[model samples]
Target chain A: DQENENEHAKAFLGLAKCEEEVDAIEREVELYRLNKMKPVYEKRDAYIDEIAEFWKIVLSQHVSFANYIRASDFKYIDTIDKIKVEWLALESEMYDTRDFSITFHFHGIEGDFKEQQVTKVFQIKKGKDDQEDGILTSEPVPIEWPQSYDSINPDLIKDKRSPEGKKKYRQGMKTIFGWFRWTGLKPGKEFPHGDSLASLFSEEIYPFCVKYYAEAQRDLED
Target chain B: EHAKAFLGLAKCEEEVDAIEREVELYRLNKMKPVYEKRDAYIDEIAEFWKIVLSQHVSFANYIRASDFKYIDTIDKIKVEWLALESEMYDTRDFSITFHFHGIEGDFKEQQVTKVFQIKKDGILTSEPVPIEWPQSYDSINPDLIKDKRSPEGKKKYRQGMKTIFGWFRWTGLKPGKEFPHGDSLASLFSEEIYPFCVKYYAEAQRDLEDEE
Candidate 1:
């Protein structure tokens, strides 16, 4: 009986390894979707967040600019210069594990546009260089839908304004934040527990009908 | 003639002499980098987790099953989920700009490249990678926030925590509202606590499930 118990535990251990591999595979699939075709570049989780942020900000040409406005006013060309400093810091942050050049381009600032715009030329690589010429992402990485970056800008969005001001404000919002966007996963209200956004973190889609295949950390490995 | 001369000199100065700094827009100090990695944070942590993971591995060895129970302590600590959530708010750590009109934002454009996402139902949206975050101050056990459970099983849980959470013995978290932010919480959870918790929770839950 002792021998049998040991054998049972051994069998369980063996099966658990297979389960772990399965979890790894599922996670790999999620990685592909989250970052388009770019596999995790440097550190796996950090890479996912970086790539997701790139898409989030770029595709979000709308909210980001407004966020920029709330964050900075391009009243003078000097402001754009300051914005470029931010852009440079964000752009050079991390490199892709497979290839480093695949980074995001965030803003087109207010400061010294004539100068910084010229500098941008060196940063822009031929899209064809990433893959076959003109291939430019036929298969893009899918995300968990989108989110409304909404007016964290209280000065403009929430306060009452003139009819023309409101019109310009609404137009600016549509132009800045993009249309009504939502993340794809449907969940109970959006907080930490009910958070649909958590999908961006791990691939534990057990609530979504995927079985426990040992893809993440092991079911028992803790 | 004077205008042409001024434009020519301005074009010449464009490369290094940017126009913005020529005039001060507003007065605030230049923002410094948000995270500061101390050598001790990594060195001491490596020393701590080395003992911790090894202890769990030793327990696994005692059971005579090499792989079955080795890393279960990871989940026991809830580090994995905390790591994932922390990545989402990684931007909060950035060194921001104090722009005009009270608008403040990070000057750094860093993205969350190292963290993974876990969906609502414990599913991984993607495989995780190592994304480093800025650490302004290193608190040894930032994620083991507060221990509210004093009852028996809970007491044992905290004791179990001692085997792995020994680092917190020295972590100086000043008993107040100033808990380390979520990103730090997530990082510590993933690295030290999750594996053990994952193990303990499964075994304990399995027994209960069997009894049912």
Candidate 2:
């Protein structure tokens, strides 16, 4: 769930960027008419405007959303539920349900110039937080890893078949996590795949650094 | 004492959010007209999806590759239709609820919001995912990895590579090529180089087989 929160924040940041580029294109369409076609740019711009506005809201709420997710409080968290609800909205008003999850679609330039693959992994422990009297700043035991970074990616060569390729991939993942534990991370504290939450929200959340750094550095020292 | 203090932090965060929400609502109310128009455009695209579905008369049926050839200039139609749909369906929020049972985790009912759909022009769009989540597995920490690959692990590492190594690089890889980590491996074959290429290649091939 903590992982999901980080991903949600990351995904929304990308969405916010997408909104900007789309808006620029909409304005371009407005600047010059194309062969006397009805200036459909207005129509196009309408959708662009909607997306832009959506991201603006998401960007603002992202910080709150992250904090809530980390603490495992799900009472009012509705993004995922809204997705299932809206998907049904596509079919008819009849298929309504109280349960759902959020779904994100990323559009990108396909085929390798700068192709990106995103996988979302999550870990949740039942009653783990309840056992704790309070949030503990003191370091706990470090987590273990599967393999080191250098050997993991190259480990793929051991087998060329698709299934073997995948098996090795799993092994490699364990190694990556192992590296994080080596650096003093625990179940309560994850410190890999990304660095510095302060940098992530610095621009999106004002004085984000002040609050994040203060809390984080204190955690590190203690 | 510590328990009380943590709760205090939580309460403080709530206060901050309550204040922010009020400001957010004010802004949304201040600019209602702009947002409504955008909403309408999204509806327009959704309705267009129904028209595409109209081509199929029967329920409980899926479109086949041969059926796809029946589409006139489908390549063009697909191009334009998808662009318009993509225009409407931007990024969205998505989340899942789950708990690790053993090796695999249990996925319960999940709630996701802000889904964007891609119109496959009578085919299928992907199952919507979190807009920002990439499908790559992130690095998990490993103890074995650290001890084996330290500066002392170099010779053992080379022997390890020899024992288990076979990735089909699309481009030629020179042996003895110095790499930070296998520079001999072509970035081209990897998703890091170009995602969807092999997938696209596989797709194009499927179409050809159906055509034959």
Candidate 3:
């Protein structure tokens, strides 16, 4: 009944709080890895991945306004502007009977690319001013990159420990977070056909790496 | 203590599920947005989304600018596009001919190409009709590289086809070619690539006009 609407609002607020947990846990995993703890670090990291996956599912199941779409009219290579009608999925958080925390996914691009299909879901959710979005305000989730000289590489971590490479120990981990995001698509999975966060990062975020690494790798005085 | 932490994580997951269920109920009841208030939220999101869209642009440009990095993991990078019908519509597609490139040096490179049509105007969800493909995905003639009057202008020509695997890596667009831990080239092109290519190809054409 609408009478229980308050309960529903409270539930959403609860989810907002859960985002904090997700953020905190991710930071914790990064911290542990920074402290030169590896064996157990990946295990803790697994928890974060699990939580993040669960969060996306929850978003798709309830808050998902347009989590999926297919291009049945225009070919991806034909149009330079909106190829079809724009689909807007807007959902809001109820606060004092007012929509305070709001989240939306815009279908900026969803189409077929022959061998690989694409679905771009630009997600944005804000909470009563203090409710900052995850990717922007927080550290970048260190999605497992199989080959790279970055945070996700265990060898890099091992090579950065104490006296040997103490200063560079925390090199990749620091300033590397909050810049990009990736969704789980097992090794050979054909990037899912619909809206998925398969492999995504923005123009603004990529440049951050240059300044981020340069600036953060600054001084040492004893 | 370990158990407690694990339990806390589990609780967060469960609470998230409960919240989802509650929101689902509201959705089932047909709740509508507070129009005025909703707009503000949307406005805020719109501002943030622009940043993301721009970020995607950089990713695509980096690959284009780098000429696909010349990585062995990719066979070829193919791009096709259709100029906007009006000032408000667009249609485009890009392909990375990978998991396989053409055979032999001086040998025309074979690239996989696909052409799409914007069945609908000004809308982004139209069924893109793939009505074209070259019989042979071969590379340009070797002579074009030094042609003084060739139709395909000599801008340095594709000097040794290269690839920027990082582009596919960054976009998570699987390709036809195989990679370690299961990743391929030319499987997908995100929203950011098509538009950038549109602009890029146009600029290339403009330069040739100046050259002519």
**Which candidate gets the maximum lDDT versus the true structure?**
3
Per-residue CA lDDT of model 3 for A180-201, tens digit only, reads 2222222222223211221112
Candidate 3 DockQ, CA atoms: 0.02
Ranking by DockQ: 3, 1, 2
lDDT of 1 by residue, A1-222 (tens): 777666545544644554355344444343333343122112222322322222232222322223323232222212221111111212342322111111222333333222222111112113455432221111112111112323332233664276755554544333212111212232221111211212211212211111222122133475
lDDT of each model, Cα atoms only? Answer: 0.27, 0.28, 0.29
Candidate 2 stretches greater than 4 Å from native: A1-170, A176-222, B36-212
Q: What are the candidates' interface root-mean-square deviations?
A: 21.5, 22.3, 17.3
CAPRI band for model 3: incorrect
Residue B76 in candidate 3 has what lDDT? 26
Among all windows of 10 consecutive residues in model 1 chain A, the one with the lowest summed lDDT is A135-144
Clashes of each: 82, 58, 53
Residue B194 Cα positional deviation in candidate 1, in Å, after optimal superposition:
21
lDDT tens digits, residue span A1-222, model 2: 777666555644543454454444433332221211112222322332333223233333455435412121121121111110011222332322211112222222233112222222111123364433222111212322112333344333465246877555544443322222222225423333322222233223322322442354365585
Give candidate 3's error at residue B16 in angstroms. 5.5
lDDT of 2 at A202: 23
**What C-alpha RMSD separates each model from the true structure?**
27.7, 30.3, 25.8
